Amino acid sequence: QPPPKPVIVDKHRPVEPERRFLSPEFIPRRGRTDPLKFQIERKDMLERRKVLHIPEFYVGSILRVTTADPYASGKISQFLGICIQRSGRGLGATFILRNVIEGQGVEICFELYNPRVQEIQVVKLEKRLDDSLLYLRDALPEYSTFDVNMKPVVQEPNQKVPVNELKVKMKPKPWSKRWERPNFNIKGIRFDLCLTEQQMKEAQKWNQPWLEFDMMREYDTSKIEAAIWKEIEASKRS
Amino acid sequence: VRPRLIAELARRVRALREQLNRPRDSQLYAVDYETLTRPFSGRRLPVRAWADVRRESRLLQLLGRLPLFGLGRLVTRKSWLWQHDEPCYWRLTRVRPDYTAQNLDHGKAWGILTFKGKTESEAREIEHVMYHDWRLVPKHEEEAFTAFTASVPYPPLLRAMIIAERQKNGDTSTEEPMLNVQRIRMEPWDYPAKQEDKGRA
Amino acid sequence: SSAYVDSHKWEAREKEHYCLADLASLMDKTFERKLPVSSLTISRLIDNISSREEIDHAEYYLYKFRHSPNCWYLRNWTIHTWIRQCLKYDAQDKALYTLVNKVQYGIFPDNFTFNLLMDSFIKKENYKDALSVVFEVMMQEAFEVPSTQLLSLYVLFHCLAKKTDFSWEEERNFGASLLLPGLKQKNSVGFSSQLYGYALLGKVELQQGLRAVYHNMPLIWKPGYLDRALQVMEKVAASPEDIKLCREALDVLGAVLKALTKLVEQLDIEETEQSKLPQYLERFKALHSKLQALKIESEGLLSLTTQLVKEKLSTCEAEDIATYEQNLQQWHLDLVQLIQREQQQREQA
Amino acid sequence: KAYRGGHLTIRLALGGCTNRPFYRIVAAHNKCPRDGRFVEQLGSYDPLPNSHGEKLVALNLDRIRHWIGCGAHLSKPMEKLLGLAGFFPLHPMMITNAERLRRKRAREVLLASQKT
Ligand SMILES: [Mg+2]
């Protein structure tokens, strides 16, 4: 006997269609330079994208990566980890992964355009309230404790991004970065428990509202991101 | 006196985990017809049943080919009808297959039975359901199938002892002492048994 | 018989109109948390289906229900909702697939519903599908039905239109199916079809032993099928009317070709059937001569006689429809109680 | 020593040095060792003949009846001894052994008559 085939169809109309999404590394930095540089590096990374898939993801997504290392069992290295940040621009763009194994916490900085990486995979796709999750170092190890054998949580092909609205407990105060300050604008931590009303009132000393109220520092992107959409479509269809 | 708690804790946890994720009916009843060894046990089957396991199928596999697993349908104990000519059957009343089974080929089911045409007024349960020794009888050829129709001396030493006893008593009692045997319900081996009494891994 | 086939009550009676996607999501959640579920969900789902891929979703969820903690219920009205939803939207491949692997899906249509199905098969004018389906009805063992006349028509037509010389599986399927329709004790057609089925079963035994006779087929173990055939022919010649067809010639051919030149299930005292073949054939010739001495036209074509059965067929269709409407109205009576039974949970909540 | 389940059983305990067994029919639990503890020393048996040639055995009839009425199963050698005594039915395996020995002896006498 052959096995049946699973089939599921849910057709709520104004949910399925999500429109577009851009990567955080196609956009350039605020600095001044000739857009020719950006165009060239962009067409190079797109000629590479024709090969490599880089499945869409965000910070707080769990990624599994296979890379061709010259020294290893089979010369291949597997690594699974939570994405802490995506840094850099152009070909040098990287993403950080972290994982605690055997009670010890390891972190990798992967270049997503290096050729020695064999392929990327998204075991889980999530978004955290904090855009950068480097406080997981001081957080409890159990938050970053992710197993390697966990299989990909299949996500529907066209849906909104799931945002887990949660908070995290942390190691006692002897930290490295002093996360309680307002310049970080982070919310996953639970300082109501991790520190006192007096210490939070002392930390709000450094509150600088004129940063976000100022209007000459931000960087409008619509123009250049539209141009990037245009060039991506062109190089794709070509 | 010093009490101890972790022992009872482990007892409770083990009982809970056992009742939770014990091996399934079909899982522990499955058999490979080539090697004749049950998985999860690594035990071989008896030589007398090797051929039955190779050729014949199981009770739930017989019952899966008809609606509701055939309530009141004629299923006979093949072993009974090979051990004797008289008809014996199972008035199956309740049925429950195991959902984890792929072909729904395992479960628990029973009802009233009959041995040598002797009915009993109790829906008591089956014996040895999971064997490959089951035969289904159709709805035709049913009535012709279901149709059906002192004492011993004591041992020599014991009777001599009783003779001396009643001689000392003073009564001659010329009759030879005997016991009742029609009362004794000498039952054949194959008369079935209860499942709740026997355990399960 | 378009009135016997179609029925507007079933399609215009007690429609639910719930969201197919919502019911699918609910059933998926319930079967992922692997707790038991009532048949009301599947029933409402099937009643709400109006599409091919929706019927496919129903197939998958019915497989899940078969492999769910509770599947014995298998309500006849639910499976008939499914049957209608399938056959009106014309999924005959799926219908046949489910009906053949009933053990995989467990559909069990009643007499009138199956007669509707086979009448649709007649209207579409297909033969091999109906043949396989009547073999599956032989598996079902449900023949105390007014569809017995339809089964007889089908078998008597297809055994003649077969054109297949040697096939052991199919020949055993025939020799086993030809008995059940004739068991209603009606006429020459009935008991002579019983006789020919006994002959076919004896042939299958002689050619591949008695094992397959009972292993994957519910049959009786008495190897003397030829003895039973001789007994039937003898009592018929002794006794009514005997409108005969020349399948006795096929019986003669089989007997003569078998008379022509490991586990031991046979008993020692009892002789071997190989060694009974000779006296089998001698007594068969004897009964042949006795019958021709005693009805012996041997020209009335058996399938042609089944159109004369169409009159009392149309007669019994009366009480067939009557019982069907009774079943419909009592379904409607006892089913509404289960709707409020589900509302009891929300009331308690 | 409280044993899990088990039951009372009259059986044989062994005494004496090697090549000189001395059996003792005695009531005890099913789980006890061979010469383990017991409840009541019931009777005795010597499988060797005396100077006169007799082989001795002693049985306590009333106490054995009391124990059987209380409930205790029997081991095959001691129930065989009881059957030989006659207080108990004779053993079917003993009947079969006797019949087999007689068949073999008849066969051997037949072989000797054929050879001679
Ligand atoms: Mg530091």
Subunits close to A (at least 3 CB pairs below 8 A): C
DSSP state of C299: -
DSSP state of B183: S
Q: Output the CA angle A102-A103-A106, nearest 5 degrees.
A: 85
Q: Is C308 left (phi over 0), alpha (psi -120 to 50) or beta?
A: alpha
Q: Is D29 left (phi over 0), alpha (psi -120 to 50) or beta?
A: beta
Measured CA distances, A207 to A180, A192, A196, A216, B110 (Å)? 11, 18, 17, 19, 77
Does one domain contain both B97 and B158?
no
CA torsion, ordered A61, A66, A67, A71, to nearest 10 deg: 120
Query: Are residues B104 and C211, on separate chains, in Cβ contact within 8 Å?
Result: no
C1 contacts C310 by C-beta, under 8 angstroms: no
In a domain, B74, yes or no: yes
C25, C53, C59 ranked by CB distance to A4: nearest:
C59
Q: Which residue has the tokens 């609910």?
A: C26
Query: Are residues B66 and C140, on separate chains, in Cβ contact within 8 Å?
Result: yes
Measured CA distances, C190 to C145, C156, C317 (Å)? 15, 11, 20
Residue type, A112: L
H/E stretch holding B178: strand B178-180
DSSP-assigned states of every residue in C319-331: HHHHHHHHHHHHH
Nearest to C142 by CA among C90, C107, C95: C107
C137 φ/ψ angles, rounded to the nearest 5 degrees = -70, -35
SS (H, E, C) chain D: CCCCCCCEEEEEEEECCCCCCEEEEEEEECCCCCCCCCCEEEEEECCCCCCCCCCCEECCHHHHHHHHHHCCEECHHHHHHHHHHCCCCCCHHHHHHHHHHHHHHHHHHHHHHHHC
What CA–CA distance (Å, rounded) separates C335 from C345? 17
User: CA of B152: which chain D residue's CA is closest?
Assistant: D89
Do B and C share at least 3 CB pairs under 8 Å?
Answer: yes
What CA–CA distance (Å, rounded) separates C147 from C112? 7
3-state secondary structure of B40: coil
A127 φ/ψ angles, rounded to the nearest 5 degrees = -135, 130
Does one domain contain both B180 and B91?
no
Residue type, C308: L
Residues 6+ apart with CB under 8 A from A197: none
DSSP-assigned states of every residue in chain A: -PPP--------TTTS-------TTTS--SS---HHHHHHHHHHHHHHHTT-------TT-EEEEEEE-SSSGGGEEEEEEEEEEEE--GGG-EEEEEEEETTEEEEEEEETT-TTEEEEEEEE--B-SSS--GGGTTB-HHHH---SSPPP----SS-PPPB----B-B--S--SS-TTSTTS---SB-HHHHS-HHHHHHHGGG--HHHHH--SSS---HHHHHHHHHHHHHHHH-
Residues 6+ apart with CB under 8 A from D22: D14, D15, D16, D44, D45, D46
B112 contacts B89 by C-beta, under 8 angstroms: no
Burial class (CB in 10 A: 0-12, 13-18, 19+), C344: exposed
Is C67's Cβ below 8 Å from some Cβ in B?
A: yes
Single out the residue in B149, B174, B195 at which a domain terminates: B149
Residue type, D94: M
- To the nearest whole Å, the CA of B159 is away from the closest chain D CA by 9
A5, A7, A10 ranked by CB distance to C21: nearest:
A10
The number of beta carbons lying within 10 Å of the beta carbon of residue D51 is 5
Question: Is the Cα dihedral B50, B53, B54, B56 positive or negative?
Answer: positive
A229 φ/ψ angles, rounded to the nearest 5 degrees = -55, -45
Tokens of A38: 């950006």
Q: Which residue has the tokens 């123009």?
A: A223
Tokens of A158: 């066209």
In a domain, B89, yes or no: yes
Does one domain contain both B79 and B128?
yes
User: CA of A4: which chain C residue's CA is closest?
Assistant: C60
H/E stretch holding B17: helix B6-21
In a domain, B173, yes or no: yes
Residues 6+ apart with CB under 8 A from B63: B69, B70, B75, B95, B109, B136
What CA–CA distance (Å, rounded) separates C7 from B196? 51
What CA–CA distance (Å, rounded) separates B129 from B110? 9
3-state secondary structure of B107: strand
Q: Which residue has the tokens 């079969």?
A: D96
Boundaries of domain holding B179: 150-186
What CA–CA distance (Å, rounded) separates B111 from B109? 7
C19 contacts C336 by C-beta, under 8 angstroms: no
Does one domain contain both B63 and B144?
yes
Burial class (CB in 10 A: 0-12, 13-18, 19+), C155: buried
HSE, side-chain direction, 13 A CA sphere, residue B15: 6
A171 contacts A138 by C-beta, under 8 angstroms: yes
User: CA of B159: which chain D residue's CA is closest?
Assistant: D87
Tokens of C156: 């008597």
Is C288's Cβ below 8 Å from some Cβ in B?
A: no
C204 contacts C245 by C-beta, under 8 angstroms: no
Mark B117-144 as b/e (b = at least 16 C-beta within 10 Å).
eeeeeeeebbbebbbbbbbbbbbbeeee
Q: How many domains is chain B partitioned into structurally? A: 2
Q: Is C141 left (phi over 0), alpha (psi -120 to 50) or beta?
A: left
**Where would I find the H helices in chain C?**
2-5, 8-11, 20-32, 39-48, 52-66, 76-88, 92-100, 102-105, 111-124, 128-140, 148-158, 168-177, 188-208, 211-214, 225-238, 247-259, 273-293, 302-305, 309-348
Contacts of C252-255 with CB under 8 Å at 24 or more apart are C252/C284, C252/C288, C254/C199, C254/C203, C255/C226, C255/C280, C255/C281, C255/C284
Q: Kindly give the pairing relationship between strand A62-68 and strand D8-15.
A: unpaired
C interface with A, Cβ–Cβ < 8 A, is: 20-21, 24-25, 28, 53-54, 56-57, 59-60, 63, 101, 104
What CA–CA distance (Å, rounded) separates C94 from C88? 13
Instruction: Return the domain boundaries, chain D.
Output: 1-115
Does one domain contain both B129 and B44?
yes
3-state secondary structure of B111: strand
Nearest to B107 by CA among B123, B126, B88: B126
Question: Is the Cα dihedral B56, B58, B59, B63 positive or negative?
Answer: negative
User: CA of C36: which chain B residue's CA is closest?
Assistant: B99
Does one domain contain both B105 and B136?
yes
Residues 6+ apart with CB under 8 A from C242: C188, C192, C236, C295, C296
A89 contacts A30 by C-beta, under 8 angstroms: no
What CA–CA distance (Å, rounded) separates C108 from C75? 9
What CA–CA distance (Å, rounded) separates C61 from C52? 14
D42 φ/ψ angles, rounded to the nearest 5 degrees = -85, -60
Burial class (CB in 10 A: 0-12, 13-18, 19+), C8: exposed
Burial class (CB in 10 A: 0-12, 13-18, 19+), C174: buried
Instruction: Please identify every residue whose CB atom is under 5 Å from ligand 1, which is an ion.
Output: A 176
What CA–CA distance (Å, rounded) separates D45 from B39? 50
Nearest to C159 by CA among C275, C306, C284, C319: C306
A68 contacts A118 by C-beta, under 8 angstroms: yes
Does one domain contain both B81 and B120?
yes
What CA–CA distance (Å, rounded) separates C220 from C191? 18
3-state secondary structure of B119: strand
D42 contacts D21 by C-beta, under 8 angstroms: no
Is D84's Cβ below 8 Å from some Cβ in B?
A: no
DSSP state of B94: E
H/E stretch holding B180: strand B178-180
In a domain, B195, yes or no: no
Residues of C in contact with A9 (CB under 8 A): 20-21, 24, 53-54, 57
Residues of D in contact with B156 (CB under 8 A): 86
Tokens of D56: 């001795």
Question: Is the Cα dihedral D75, D78, D82, D84 positive or negative?
Answer: positive
3-state secondary structure of B112: strand
Residue A231 CA, distance from chain mean position: 24
Q: Kindly give the pairing relationship between strand B89-97 and strand B178-180.
A: unpaired
3-state secondary structure of C92: helix
Q: State the distance between the two ends of chain B, measured CA to CA, in whole angstroms.
A: 36
- To the nearest whole Å, the CA of D110 is away from the closest chain B CA by 36
Partners of B76 in the beta sheet? B89, B135
Does one domain contain both B144 and B166?
no
Tokens of C71: 């599947």
Question: Is the Cα dihedral A19, A24, A29, A30 positive or negative?
Answer: positive
Measured CA distances, D38 to D14, D28, D32, D73 (Å)? 13, 5, 8, 15
Residues of C in contact with B135 (CB under 8 A): 214, 221
A1, A6, A10 ranked by CB distance to C60: nearest:
A6
What CA–CA distance (Å, rounded) separates C173 from C159? 11
Q: At how many degrees (to 10) do helices C111-124 and C148-158 cross? A: 40
Does one domain contain both B42 and B119?
yes
C98 contacts C60 by C-beta, under 8 angstroms: no
What CA–CA distance (Å, rounded) separates A52 from A46? 9
Tokens of C177: 């199916």
Q: State the distance between the two ends of chain A, measured CA to CA, in whole angstroms.
A: 47
What CA–CA distance (Å, rounded) separates D85 from D45? 12
Question: Is the Cα dihedral C37, C40, C45, C46 positive or negative?
Answer: positive
Partners of A90 in the beta sheet? none
Residues 6+ apart with CB under 8 A from A90: A25, A28, A38, A41, A45
Does one domain contain both B85 and B75?
yes
Stated resolution in angstroms: 3.5
Does one domain contain both B72 and B169?
no
Q: Is A54 left (phi over 0), alpha (psi -120 to 50) or beta?
A: left
Nearest to D74 by CA among D63, D88, D86, D62: D88
B136 φ/ψ angles, rounded to the nearest 5 degrees = -95, 140
3-state secondary structure of B155: coil
Subunits close to B (at least 3 CB pairs below 8 A): C, D
B116 φ/ψ angles, rounded to the nearest 5 degrees = 60, 35
Does one domain contain both B57 and B68?
yes
In a domain, B197, yes or no: no
A88 contacts A96 by C-beta, under 8 angstroms: no
In a domain, B90, yes or no: yes
What CA–CA distance (Å, rounded) separates C273 from C266? 9
What CA–CA distance (Å, rounded) separates C179 from C200? 10
Partners of A95 in the beta sheet? A86, A110
C130 contacts C159 by C-beta, under 8 angstroms: no
C94 contacts C117 by C-beta, under 8 angstroms: no
H/E stretch holding B134: strand B134-137
H/E stretch holding B156: helix B156-169
CA torsion, ordered B54, B59, B64, B65, to nearest 10 deg: 70
